[PDB]
Symmetry: C2
Subunit: 215 residues, 2 copies
């Protein structure tokens, strides 16, 4: 297809772009643009990612896909996450479509991008129960006070778990941003072979000791 | 599988590594290591990539896979190529296995890496006739004097076509390195629906005018 040719050409072009957008000053401006984006989506409604699909050719969604993507790739990794107490180390991608969640964690459209800052609440989504990848199967083992490390554009952000809740999919109040807090939530479905509910592991930003063993 | 988990974890780790290996000094040392590698493989035999398979778990092959890969990814793009007279813009990957050649161009193991230098002769391989990607279908339209641009670790190399030959697969004499020349060959199979022969488009290095319209 023309689709495939275009896809191959874009892989080439983004490889080339990546050597022109990786300087400290461009990482800083990509991150600053992500913060501006986060301010602009503060009111957005937040839909369940297993039960709904985002409108992926809308204008704002196409804009979202340009954030954290100075190379202009298709489906780039936007950040990584590490949860060493359950030995998880996984890439995060834009959105939560079916193919994304088979190969990594998805970022829930309508929530802040995971670049830190007060007033933000990124929601990072993973399957549990997918054949042949662990993903968030062990999120239910995470405990209060466990650390979470996000890496994004060369920066490392540290979060500590503070709440663990199980809720119905319609109920997203625990996902609200709070203008005075820098938080993230990890979400997966539960229980095993049913997935009628959502497990929400919330964490808040803490200082990163430069000598953290987990770095 | 554990294989999938490991693959996902490595995607995360290489995303993180990519922000630590992209400085000018590391691009220079990756390129210098590639030149050293090229010197070490000057005598290697060169097998037809459609008719043979490299031993992909041998020691030297695993070393090859670490070249042009400071991020330590699985199957990274190692370089891109542009041939504007046939409107081709494609990524190049290590090796020439089946899955590589479905998604881009492959680099023929045993030939120099495409980083330039006298005494080198990289061979870049593409299919013709694959359903649903053009790849090297139009290589047969390339003419003498046409330019070829390789981009690698942020550098751009310009080559100009000087020979076009059709040969049998066993016959690789036109692929020999020449200690006084900086050359590349593009190879595909021919003719349509038969692929009994190989089309070899050879080009030599020329000065890159910084104001080349094709940049």
């Amino acid at each position: 297809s023309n689709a495939n040719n275009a896809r191959q050409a874009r892989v080439a072009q983004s490889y080339e772009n990546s050597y022109e957008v990786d300087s400290p000053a461009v990482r800083d401006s990509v991150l600053e643009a992500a913060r501006q984006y986060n301010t602009s989506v503060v009111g957005f409604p937040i839909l369940d990612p297993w039960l709904n699909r985002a409108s992926k050719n809308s204008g704002p969604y196409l804009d979202y896909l340009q954030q954290l993507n100075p190379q202009r790739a298709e489906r780039p990794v936007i950040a990584s996450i590490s949860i060493p107490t359950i030995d998880a180390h996984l890439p995060i991608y834009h959105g939560t479509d079916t193919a994304t969640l088979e190969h990594g964690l998805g970022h829930l459209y309508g929530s802040a991008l995971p670049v830190g800052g007060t007033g933000t609440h990124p929601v990072i989504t993973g399957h549990s129960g997918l054949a042949n990848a662990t993903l968030f199967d062990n999120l239910e083992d995470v405990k209060e006070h466990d650390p979470i490390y996000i890496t994004v554009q060369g920066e490392t952000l540290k979060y500590e778990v503070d709440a663990i809740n199980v809720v119905l999919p319609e109920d997203t109040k625990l996902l609200a941003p709070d203008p005075n807090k820098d938080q993230i939530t990890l979400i997966t479905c539960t229980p095993y072979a049913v997935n009628s509910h959502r497990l929400l592991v919330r964490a808040h930003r803490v200082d990163l000791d430069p000598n953290d063993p987990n770095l």
